[PDB]
Amino acid sequence: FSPXAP
Amino acid sequence: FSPXAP
Amino acid sequence: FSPXAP
Amino acid sequence: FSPXAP
Amino acid sequence: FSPXAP
Amino acid sequence: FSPXAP
Amino acid sequence: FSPXAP
Amino acid sequence: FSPXAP
Amino acid sequence: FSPXAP
Amino acid sequence: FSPXAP
Amino acid sequence: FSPXAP
Amino acid sequence: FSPXAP
Amino acid sequence: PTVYDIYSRLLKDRIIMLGSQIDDNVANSIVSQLLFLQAQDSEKDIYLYINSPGGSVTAGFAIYDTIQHIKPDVQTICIGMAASMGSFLLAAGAKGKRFALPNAEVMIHQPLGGAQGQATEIEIAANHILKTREKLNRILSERTGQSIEKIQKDTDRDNFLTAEEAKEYGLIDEVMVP
Amino acid sequence: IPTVYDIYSRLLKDRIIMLGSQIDDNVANSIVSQLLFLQAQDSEKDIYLYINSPGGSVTAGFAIYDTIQHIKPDVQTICIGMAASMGSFLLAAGAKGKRFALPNAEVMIHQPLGGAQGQATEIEIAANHILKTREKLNRILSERTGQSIEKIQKDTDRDNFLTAEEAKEYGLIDEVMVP
Amino acid sequence: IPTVYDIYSRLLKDRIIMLGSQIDDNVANSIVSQLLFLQAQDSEKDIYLYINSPGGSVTAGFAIYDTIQHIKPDVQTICIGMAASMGSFLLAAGAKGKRFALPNAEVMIHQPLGGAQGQATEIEIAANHILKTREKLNRILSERTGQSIEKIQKDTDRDNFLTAEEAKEYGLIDEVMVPE
Amino acid sequence: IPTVYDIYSRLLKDRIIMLGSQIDDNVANSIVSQLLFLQAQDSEKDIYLYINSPGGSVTAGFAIYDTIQHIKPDVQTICIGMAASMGSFLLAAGAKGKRFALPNAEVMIHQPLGGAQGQATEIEIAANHILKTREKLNRILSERTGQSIEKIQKDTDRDNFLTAEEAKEYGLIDEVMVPE
Amino acid sequence: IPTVYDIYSRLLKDRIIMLGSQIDDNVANSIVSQLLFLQAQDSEKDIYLYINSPGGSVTAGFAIYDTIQHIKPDVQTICIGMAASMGSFLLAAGAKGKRFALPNAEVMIHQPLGGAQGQATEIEIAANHILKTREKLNRILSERTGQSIEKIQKDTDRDNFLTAEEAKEYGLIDEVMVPE
Amino acid sequence: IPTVYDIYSRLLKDRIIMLGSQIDDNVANSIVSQLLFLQAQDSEKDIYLYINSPGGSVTAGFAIYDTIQHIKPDVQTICIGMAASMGSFLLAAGAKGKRFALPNAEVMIHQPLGGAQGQATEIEIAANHILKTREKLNRILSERTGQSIEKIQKDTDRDNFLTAEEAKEYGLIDEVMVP
Amino acid sequence: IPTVYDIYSRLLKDRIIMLGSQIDDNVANSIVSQLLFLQAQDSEKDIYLYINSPGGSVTAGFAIYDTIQHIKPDVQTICIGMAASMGSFLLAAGAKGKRFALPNAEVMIHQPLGGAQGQATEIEIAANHILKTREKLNRILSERTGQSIEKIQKDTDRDNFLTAEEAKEYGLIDEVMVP
Amino acid sequence: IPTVYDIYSRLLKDRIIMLGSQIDDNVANSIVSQLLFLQAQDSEKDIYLYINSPGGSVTAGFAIYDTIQHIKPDVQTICIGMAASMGSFLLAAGAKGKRFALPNAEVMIHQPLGGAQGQATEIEIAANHILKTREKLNRILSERTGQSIEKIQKDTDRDNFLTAEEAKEYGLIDEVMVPE
Amino acid sequence: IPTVYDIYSRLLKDRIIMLGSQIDDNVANSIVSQLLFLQAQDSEKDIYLYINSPGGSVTAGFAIYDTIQHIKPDVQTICIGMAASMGSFLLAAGAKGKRFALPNAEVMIHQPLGGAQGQATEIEIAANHILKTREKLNRILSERTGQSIEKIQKDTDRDNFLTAEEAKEYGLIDEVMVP
Amino acid sequence: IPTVDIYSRLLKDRIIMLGSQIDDNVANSIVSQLLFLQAQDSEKDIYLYINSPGGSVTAGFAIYDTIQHIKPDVQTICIGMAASMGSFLLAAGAKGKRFALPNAEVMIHQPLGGAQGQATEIEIAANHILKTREKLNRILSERTGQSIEKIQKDTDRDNFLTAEEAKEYGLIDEVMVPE
Amino acid sequence: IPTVYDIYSRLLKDRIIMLGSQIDDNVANSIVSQLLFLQAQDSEKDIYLYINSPGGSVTAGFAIYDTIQHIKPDVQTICIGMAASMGSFLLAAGAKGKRFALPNAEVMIHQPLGGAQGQATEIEIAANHILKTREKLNRILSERTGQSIEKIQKDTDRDNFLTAEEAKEYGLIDEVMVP
Numbered sequence A, B, C, D, E, F, G, H, I, J, K, L: 001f002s003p004x005a006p
Numbered sequence M: 001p002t003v004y005d006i007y008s009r010l011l012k013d014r015i016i017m018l019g020s021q022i023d024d025n026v027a028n029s030i031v032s033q034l035l036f037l038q039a040q041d042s043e044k045d046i047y048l049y050i051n052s053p054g055g056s057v058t059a060g061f062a063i064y065d066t067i068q069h070i071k072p073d074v075q076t077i078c079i080g081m082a083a084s085m086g087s088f089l090l091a092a093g094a095k096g097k098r099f100a101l102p103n104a105e106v107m108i109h110q111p112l113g114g115a116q117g118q119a120t121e122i123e124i125a126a127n128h129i130l131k132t133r134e135k136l137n138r139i140l141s142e143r144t145g146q147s148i149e150k151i152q153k154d155t156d157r158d159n160f161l162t163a164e165e166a167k168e169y170g171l172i173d174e175v176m177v178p
Numbered sequence N, R, S, U, W: 001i002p003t004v005y006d007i008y009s010r011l012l013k014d015r016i017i018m019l020g021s022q023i024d025d026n027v028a029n030s031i032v033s034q035l036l037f038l039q040a041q042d043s044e045k046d047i048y049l050y051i052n053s054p055g056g057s058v059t060a061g062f063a064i065y066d067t068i069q070h071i072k073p074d075v076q077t078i079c080i081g082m083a084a085s086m087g088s089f090l091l092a093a094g095a096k097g098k099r100f101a102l103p104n105a106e107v108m109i110h111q112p113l114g115g116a117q118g119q120a121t122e123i124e125i126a127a128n129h130i131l132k133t134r135e136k137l138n139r140i141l142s143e144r145t146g147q148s149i150e151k152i153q154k155d156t157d158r159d160n161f162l163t164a165e166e167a168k169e170y171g172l173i174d175e176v177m178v179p
Numbered sequence O, P, Q, T: 001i002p003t004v005y006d007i008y009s010r011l012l013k014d015r016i017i018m019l020g021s022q023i024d025d026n027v028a029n030s031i032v033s034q035l036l037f038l039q040a041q042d043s044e045k046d047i048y049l050y051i052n053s054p055g056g057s058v059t060a061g062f063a064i065y066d067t068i069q070h071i072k073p074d075v076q077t078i079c080i081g082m083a084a085s086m087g088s089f090l091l092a093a094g095a096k097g098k099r100f101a102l103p104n105a106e107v108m109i110h111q112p113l114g115g116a117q118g119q120a121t122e123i124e125i126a127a128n129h130i131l132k133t134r135e136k137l138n139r140i141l142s143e144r145t146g147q148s149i150e151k152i153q154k155d156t157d158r159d160n161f162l163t164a165e166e167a168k169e170y171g172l173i174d175e176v177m178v179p180e
Numbered sequence V: 001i002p003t004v005d006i007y008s009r010l011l012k013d014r015i016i017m018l019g020s021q022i023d024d025n026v027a028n029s030i031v032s033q034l035l036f037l038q039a040q041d042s043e044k045d046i047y048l049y050i051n052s053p054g055g056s057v058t059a060g061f062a063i064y065d066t067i068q069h070i071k072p073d074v075q076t077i078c079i080g081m082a083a084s085m086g087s088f089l090l091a092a093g094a095k096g097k098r099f100a101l102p103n104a105e106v107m108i109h110q111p112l113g114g115a116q117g118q119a120t121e122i123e124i125a126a127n128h129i130l131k132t133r134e135k136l137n138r139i140l141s142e143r144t145g146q147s148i149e150k151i152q153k154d155t156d157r158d159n160f161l162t163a164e165e166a167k168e169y170g171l172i173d174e175v176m177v178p179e
Helices: M006-012 M024-040 M057-069 M085-091 M119-144 M148-154 M163-169 N007-013 N025-041 N058-070 N086-092 N120-145 N149-155 N164-170 O007-013 O025-041 O058-070 O086-092 O120-145 O149-155 O164-170 P007-013 P025-041 P058-070 P086-092 P120-145 P149-155 P164-170 Q007-013 Q025-041 Q058-070 Q086-092 Q120-145 Q149-155 Q164-170 R007-013 R025-041 R058-070 R086-092 R120-145 R149-155 R164-170 S007-013 S025-041 S058-070 S086-092 S120-145 S149-155 S164-170 T007-013 T025-041 T058-070 T086-092 T120-145 T149-155 T164-170 U007-013 U025-041 U058-070 U086-092 U120-145 U149-155 U164-170 V006-012 V024-040 V057-069 V085-091 V119-144 V148-154 V163-169 W007-013 W025-041 W058-070 W086-092 W120-145 W149-155 W164-170
Strands: M015-018 M046-052 M074-083 M098-100 M105-108 M112-118 M159-162 N016-019 N047-053 N075-084 N099-101 N106-109 N113-119 N160-163 O016-019 O047-053 O075-084 O099-101 O106-109 O113-119 O160-163 P016-019 P047-053 P075-084 P099-101 P106-109 P113-119 P160-163 Q016-019 Q047-053 Q075-084 Q099-101 Q106-109 Q113-119 Q160-163 R016-019 R047-053 R075-084 R099-101 R106-109 R160-163 S016-019 S047-053 S075-084 S099-101 S106-109 S113-119 S160-163 T016-019 T047-053 T075-084 T099-101 T106-109 T113-119 T160-163 U016-019 U047-053 U075-084 U099-101 U106-109 U113-119 U160-163 V015-018 V046-052 V074-083 V098-100 V105-108 V112-118 V159-162 W016-019 W047-053 W075-084 W099-101 W106-109 W113-119 W160-163
Touching (some): M006 N025, M024 M057, M024 O075, M046 N025, M057 M085, M057 O075, M098 M163, M112 M119, M119 M148, M119 O160, N025 N047, N025 N058, N047 P025, N047 P058, N086 N099, N113 Q120, N120 N149, O016 O025, O025 O047, O058 O086, O058 O120, O058 R047, O086 O106, O086 O120, O099 O164, O160 O164, P007 P016, P007 S025, P025 P047, P058 P120, P075 S058, P099 P164, P113 T120, P120 T120, P160 P164, Q016 Q025, Q016 U025, Q025 T047, Q025 T075, Q047 U025, Q058 Q086, Q058 T075, Q086 Q106, Q086 Q120, Q099 Q164, Q113 Q120, Q120 Q149, R007 R016, R025 R047, R058 R086, R075 R086, S025 S058, S086 S099, S099 S164, S113 V119, T007 T016, T016 T025, T025 T058, T025 V046, T058 V046, T058 V074, T086 T099, T086 T106, T106 T164, T113 T120, U007 U016, U025 U058, U058 U086, U075 W025, U086 U099, U086 U120, U099 U164, V006 V015, V057 V119, V112 V119, V119 V148, W007 W016, W016 W025, W025 W047, W047 W086, W058 W120, W106 W164
Parallel strands (some): M074 M098, M074 M105, O047 O075, P075 P099, P075 P106, Q047 Q075, Q075 Q106, R016 R047, R047 R075, R075 R099, T016 T047, T075 T106, U047 U075, U075 U106, V074 V098, V074 V105
Antiparallel strands (some): M105 M159, M112 U113, N113 Q113, Q106 Q160, R106 R160, T106 T160, V105 V159
């Protein structure tokens, strides 16, 4: 899940 | 059940 | 059952 | 349960 | 069963 | 259990 | 068992 | 399933 | 199974 | 099993 | 877990 | 198991 | 409960209760009761009260044949449910003396069975159950006044009748009205 | 059951019948027999049906129902504890003016339960039959409670728990017995 | 079962014995005992054996059979409902002229059933025994029905369902009881 | 159960009823019947309900409860051993001044137990019903013990074991029976 | 399952899909995927669906059915062994002129099977649904075989076993594949 | 089981004892007790032991056997249906001249059956015990039938089914009761 | 159970009560009832409680215990065979001077047994309750045997089997009945 | 599963994800992972979620739902065969304009299912939770279909089976994929 | 199952197919697929079907049977161990002149097995179907063995065990493979 | 599980999946993954995705302690459900980097367990589970900023939080919203 | 099974086949296939069949037996551990002069086992078949060992355990392999 995780 | 049985 | 048994 | 049954 | 037992 | 029940 | 119970 | 999925 | 399937 | 199968 | 194992 | 099998 | 258990007390008034699944034990008991009642009095009516889902065909035929054999009239009264062989027995009561209570349920259908094994064994079992069905249907025809063809069609699957419907069909003579 | 006769047989001598279990065919046959026996002993005197039952078989319940309506004596109904499903139907079936419940008794109404397995056609037959059974129950309950069939249909769609007071307001009973 | 004294005991006072279940040792011991008891009460009067049974143990059935043949009174047999396997054997074993069935009763004849597991030799013993049992059954049935042993062998090879009328034609019973 | 009459029937002649098991419908029907029978024999003399029960069905317990309150005679309650859940509710339901426990008896109070499976809507109905049952129990217990409904709610939230002395302090009983 | 690439994967390279088991969701997802994959490899060339199946889930079968009708290439159907229930429905769903069975293959047609337990209303819903599913099956079979809906209704009422030749006469297939 | 007294009790009044089931300790205790009771009522009149049994426990059978030999009255044995294993041993144990079977009755003789689980030493003990039990049975059967122990050993090695006539030829019974 | 009335009913006429099984609620209700019945027949004469029991429910045992202490007659206790757990607690509860065991009888003392499943808080409640039950048992046993609470706590920590002589030394009984 | 790579892995290379079973945590974790992996390979190209599922765990379905809404690519949904309960919820969750079903596919909507056992208070908690879950489902379905929350509440009260065409009319899908 | 390729895959490269288990749908699908695959690799060369099977599903067997008759290559059949029921039917279905069994192999022929449960009408349908299946099997066996249909009917009525030599005399195979 | 396997591909991007019940195998795997990632790069963030109903407390603490021990920040992301120990681990992520998706469900409650046996054994088990709860509550207090007393009260029974509520509580820092 | 190839595949490269389990159809199909494969690789070099088996299916064993006799290479047999029933039959089936056992290996011979259930006629067929199977086994064993059929019949009547040395004296093997 980016941004930000990744 | 009378009448009639019995 | 009569006659005949009994 | 009387009265009244019985 | 007679005779003979009994 | 008497007295008192019964 | 007597004596003594009963 | 194309078109269109894919 | 050919002919014809395949 | 040859001969003959195969 | 370093330091120190490893 | 040799000799002789194999 | 006891008054003499309730069923034995009713048996003294010539009432027989068919209140369960029909298996061999039930049929032996009912047969025996029928014969016993005839021996006590060959002229007075007997009353068979029916609340049964049916069961064994041969067991039911033991009851059926005993009913037809004895001299007293056997009245039948459906209370609750008469299904399968139970409805067959309901219909087997003395003509003019087959009753059901207004909310009682009557169901008719074809006989059930099973068969496992060689082709030949299956054939035997099939022949036997087909012959059993024809026999049931023929008797029902005679007792209801419907044609064999109509009985065959109407028993092909589960067929639920109201008491009034059972009367219209000829399975009973009267709906007992309170 | 202790002995005084066992307790239920002793109560039967006073014309009290106990419907105190799940309603199956054996229970119905017993209650039917008891009702007829009591009528034969005395056709004028009241009979008392005490009810503590979660319900059970609809056809078994109808055997009891029809027997109650057939006989000459009035059958009083008294709910002690619980009258659910067919039990509540039977509670409501007592002679008008003589249907009671105890204050903390629980009354529950709902639709009939069943099953069906097999071919589409078989399922259809089973569905038709259970729907017709429900119509029959609802129609009778309508007459006995004074509620419309539509209201009974709606109110029995799911489990509906009534207090004794509520059961009286509904027309399932006539009085809440007060100490 | 209702009381009049349970219903079966009341019928036993009229010399009626009920064979109304699968035949095992308990059933055979009870029926044997009843037969002997009735003979001791009266050696001349008929006994009535009512049959509604799918059969069962052959040795148990033979206890009943041999007891019937041993005692002086005639034992009438009446098939109500079903007489299958050993039950039909017993139906056929009633006094000649006094074997009956009700019209819709079902009579079934077939070969004896069994089982054997173990060594070849054990299986051989079991096979020999069950074959000898079959020959014994067939021989007796031949004598009692008037059919040849060969015809019995063929007709019992598989399950063979007879109507009451058919059972009479075969010689397993003498009369179909017909209602008036 | 030994005989003198079986022992419980003999005690019933002295107007003692035993509530000595899990409370289900059969137990409730029997106790109700006994209560009514005793009232019919004598409407003025006290009845004695001995309690050794883990509880059970709430509706069954209420059949007993309502019957106790309906009849004219006082029903004394005596906890011997254990009165838990509905058993303790029934202990508390005896005639005021005549609720007892033996010194080592255990009394337990807690909230009602049940279950629900199915659609959201069905679970909601079941939840509402069990909550209403709890309010009814708590309200009655409040009246019988003199404690507030709020205190009963808190004290029944989990299993709460009371000694006989504690049960007396709480208002569930009037006296701890002491040995002479 | 031997290796040449397992045997089924090797056949899939020649555009042969094997429906050789009961039809459940896993089987349908696999066959759907295979159909789509083959269309992506070549949208013009025939696909061959070999059927030896007793049927199974109707919704799973319809996933396969709808996928067959959706894709551009013709899907030949070949019944080897047995095509019963949904299997026969799928057999009939092949491209017109390219539905086959081997001479000793068995084709069976019948009504859909199911169940329902619960409230009257729930049973009603289940009954309506299974009846609607049957009408949909029958209507499609009508279109695919040329028989009237009424004839399909009557002929599927109970288990109806057809020979390959009979299935051809009925319009479920176009040809019986004969050996050269 | 019908009532005339139940049927078996009525027969016991005529000194008939029924051995009609598998032989376990309950059956043996009952038959032993019956034998002793009959001897106490009359020490000279014959007792009649009717046998329809597949056998069972050897020690239970020996309780019966020893009781038969101990008491003064002759115990007639009558095989109806089947006497197998210990049942046939008991059939053979009746008073000499008064052992019967009905014509279609079946008699079976074989070696004793058992089991052993555990250490080699435990298995050895169990084996020795069952072999000693077999020698004891064979010796007694030898004396009662007039056949040699060697012949009994060979003939009991596997299941050996005898007709009533064959059982008589063997010396297991004295007469076939003919109708 | 043979008949003379059945053997236990005959013994109850001599004021002997048999505690001969695992202790559950049915057993406790029966023994309680018997104790009260005997007191009503005669408040002065001794009652005799014969004990051959592995124990069982603590609350059931306390129903018996409290009934024993409540009634006027002395209740003698006699251990035949085994008195374990609550059985030994009840053995010790007999009237002072009238607690006996036969020479080969076995007496066992230990801590109470239980279980708890659920949330931390529920386990805590169950633990507190069973610990309080143990303190109550230990305190009573202390009073009845003359042993300190500390000694009882230590000696009941695990299963502790006593001979009849040992049980007497401990103060669980007063005498070993010698033949 | 045949090999071309297994068939599902081959489809994943074309950005097709198969939701072809009951929805539990393993299935949700796999689909979530697939969605994220596809977004990392290309954040602009569409993803295709093929659905043939009876539903299952609501939390597992919400993991899938939230992942779909989080990522940048549009997720097309295609119902083949059946989309029931959470499956139909996920069908409806596809990118607006790109939710499809095949003509004979079955779509079913109903209320969430569960259970609760224990104390009154525990049952209350479980009831509150499942009611809140239902409101959350209904609210989302409202937004996705354009139907009112009240209409969704009524229409999900019992099992409600929709044809593909009906599902389109309802707003659960945008188009019925029609064969050429 | 050892590796050389697993052993069966290695044999499949030499056009050997193993029918070595009960015949159900999975086995039939595999054998059908193998047959078709081999025909696609070479339409002229012989295929070898090795049979050690108790039989199984008739429809599954017919899938195999029809595939054998459909393809161009001759399918030799070789019974090693056992060919019973459908296995023997398939043994007999090999190319004329190329059906073999090893000397100690067992061949068994019998009628088809099945089941039917339900209404009279349902049982009738099931009976008709299994009777028609049997006629079809018998007819084919007649053509392949040269025996009359009446003789096949009689000889398959019950389990009929043939030696390899007997199977050859019967016409189920052409040659017994000699070492 | 399809092949790109998908979890190994995600592990290359420093994503660890906690997607099942927490038992010892799951904990050992996650611990190992955490340590492996730290060894590959001690400065880059790690991402722990959570969809778990919880499970073993000791297994969860292995994960917890490993997270706190390593140098990289471990982000936590609740997708779907984080219950019991799963929610404890969600809360254990690096401060500022604990997330949940909008429709994710978070549940907190007290630990569950069981104990069977002697009073003393139950006491030990009760003490241990109470101490485990104190440890969990204390840590949750530090991680969320709520008092220990508030945590105690709010975990007494099952407490379901929305993602937004979990943020308000301090179990996470942000609800991830879609663009 | 460790890796060197798995160990059995490595041994198969040296023409060693392991018969190390109960003999069922899967085992027989595998051994048959291995035998044929080895003959195809080299028709002159010896094959080595190592046997540690309790036996099993007779028809499966005969598939192996006939395959051994059919192929050109000599098949040596070596009993390690146990060769019972069909295992010992196969041990005896090795090439004359090349049947061995290790010194502490156990060889057991006995008659075939089976079952039959059903009609008298069915039991007869099953009995005839198992007797014919026994005659076939005995005849072959006669030829392979040099013992008469009558001696084989007697010696296989019950379980007969032979030492390796005894098996050699009997003619089941040619040599005891000494260390």
